[PDB]
From Swiss-Prot, chain A:
Family: Belongs to the protein kinase superfamily. STE Ser/Thr protein kinase family. STE20 subfamily.
Subunit structure: Interacts with MAP3K1. Interacts with FBXW8. Interacts with CLNK (via its SH2 domain).
Residues reported in the UniProt entry to bind ATP: 18-23, 38
Cellular component terms per the entry's GO annotation: cytoplasm; membrane
Residues the record lists as Phosphothreonine modifications: 162
GO molecular function: ATP binding; MAP kinase kinase kinase kinase activity; protein serine kinase activity; protein serine/threonine kinase activity
Description of post-translational modifications: Autophosphorylates: phosphorylation promotes ubiquitination by the Cul7-RING(FBXW8) ubiquitin-protein ligase complex, leading to its degradation by the proteasome.
One Gene Ontology term from the biological process aspect of the record: positive regulation of MAPK cascade
All residue ranges annotated as the Protein kinase domain in the record: 12-261
Catalytic residues as annotated in Swiss-Prot or TrEMBL: 129 (proton acceptor)
Domain of life: Eukaryota
Official protein name in the record: Mitogen-activated protein kinase kinase kinase kinase 1
Keywords: ATP-binding, Kinase, Nucleotide-binding, Phosphoprotein, Serine/threonine-protein kinase, Transferase, Ubl conjugation
């Protein structure tokens, strides 16, 4: 897992707090390469073997659409995860300045996220948290999924020995959990709306009320507010990723052949366009020269 | 309702009932009680105790108070002289159709109440159904039912933004992926257990049973010896054992079923069983 009991300041120069555990911009002391350092506060009763396993899940990822992992540092009951630095931050950080993404910019992001998701799911990993805040953009306009599952089955293993009085739905939860990797496909459909509208659907509704409505029978999956503005391909992409039944929701590899993400002309240049907007968001210079 | 003062001060310890539950006597009133001894978050502990304390119904064991001493938690509960139905049938053998119909009615009254309080028992079985000396039926928690409910309520307060969650993820975040109707199915299995001395598939490996239950085309269990039981009993088993929880009847709905609504269902049927237990 490459977890070093050393102080991270020995190898890296902390530069600036990027966000919030806490993420910092850092420079490699020998090469001068920019990295990101995610600091996670560890409690004393935390199990070491469980931390090594979680870290190794990140370490064993070798895909272009998942942030690269360089190493980890355990010092002062604080874990420092060293990863690929993505200059433009998250898509949430970006759209909060630029406004709504265009249909082609979203199509390219969805394609890149789906490539990341197809790889994770083929390794039996579930991101579990796909949203604008967790999709990073580097200076080249490239898309990376941030780290997942760190400091997040054993309880469910206890009941497994006595299933004889269990209802079929309880037995299904006990054996495979109440969800699988297809939860990420639904989260990506919500993310595509988020990128188009600046908010996920029902964002103005109380957290608890949304949870209740989502579980309530007759629950209708979200849809894009405007119609004509978006192609039939984009509306269908949202409709199929937001399939209510996970038994009917398509896999990431199935989605990769969808018209919205398989169309020609989708490249990081679409994101470099968005980045240009980010660099100069306000109006041009006034008469005061 | 938890105290730091050692329980031996209020109660005289008696014989171990099952392990860890103990029979005990109140030092001032002489009243018999049962003490559940359990060997860490104080927020989750208070949540568990409150679930037990707020259970005030004639078909649910009464809570008296709790004691935290030597890192051990002693939960003082109402005493039921005949122990669990499991303890009983391992001595008497099979219950009759009328004794089962009476137990099912009493359990359903206990469940209708728990379900009305947004509580789920989650471990309905012969082992968790107590019988007192007067032939009355009380639902109990030998295991970790209140712990599960408390742990779920704890996870709810710490549940992050829900807006990107798939509906199935929302269901586990909100209620562990199922609802109160699981108790209805467990009651269906318990009625077979009281009739045959074991739930269906008891002889089959638990991993194999889990795979069998989660497979497509899984047939709900049925009573083995069909001619021994009435059409009403066969039907009660059929409807409580509805595979889909969308079609499974509620505890209030089940209380209007012929098997449990019929006259001549009273504690006298269990008194006959208890005398058989003493014979
Ligand atoms: C809070 C205000 N911020 C201004 C500094 C908003 C803009 N955000 C920023 O600058 C920013 C930048 C430039 N990078 C990141 C984050 C990460 C990065 O590079 N690799 C990672 C790997 C994993 C991970 F989980 C996060 C990151 C942010 C938040
Ligand atoms: C296996 C046969 N054994 C013979 C010695 C045990 C028979 N069983 C017995 O004696 C017995 C008696 C008389 N009460 C209980 C249990 C409880 C009780 O009264 N209130 C509760 C409240 C909560 C709870 F979680 C358990 C009990 C048993 C096991």
């Amino acid at each position: 897992p490459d977890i070093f009991n050393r102080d991270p300041r020995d190898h890296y120069d902390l530069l600036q707090r990027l966000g919030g555990g806490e993420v910092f911009k850092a420079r490699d002391k020998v090469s001068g390469d920019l990295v990101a350092l995610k600091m996670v506060k560890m409690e004393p009763d935390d199990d070491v073997s469980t931390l090594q396993k979680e870290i190794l899940i990140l370490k064993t990822c070798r895909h272009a659409n998942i942030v690269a992992y360089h190493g980890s540092y355990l010092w002062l009951q604080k874990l420092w995860i060293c990863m690929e630095f993505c200059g433009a931050g998250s898509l949430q950080d970006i759209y909060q300045v630029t406004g709504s993404l265009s249909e082609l910019q979203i199509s390219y992001v969805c394609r890149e996220v789906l490539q990341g998701l197809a790889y994770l799911h083929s390794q039996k990993k579930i991101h579990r948290d796909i949203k604008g805040a967790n999709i990073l953009i580097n200076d080249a306009g490239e898309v990376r999924l941030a780290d997942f599952g760190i400091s997040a089955l054993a309880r469910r293993l206890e009941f497994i020995g006595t299933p004889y009085w269990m209802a079929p739905e309880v037995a299904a939860v006990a054996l495979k959990g109440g969800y699988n990797e297809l939860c990420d496909i639904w989260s990506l459909g919500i993310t595509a709306i988020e990128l188009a509208e600046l908010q996920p659907p029902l964002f103005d509704v109380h957290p608890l009320r949304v949870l209740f409505l989502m579980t309530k029978s007759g629950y209708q999956p979200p849809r894009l507010k405007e119609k004509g503005k978006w192609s039939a391909a984009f509306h269908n992409f949202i409709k199929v990723t937001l399939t209510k039944s996970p038994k009917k929701r398509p896999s990431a590899t199935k989605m990769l052949s969808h018209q919205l993400v398989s169309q020609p002309g989708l490249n990081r240049g679409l994101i470099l366009d968005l980045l240009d907007k980010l660099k100069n968001p306000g109006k041009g210079p006034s008469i005061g020269d």
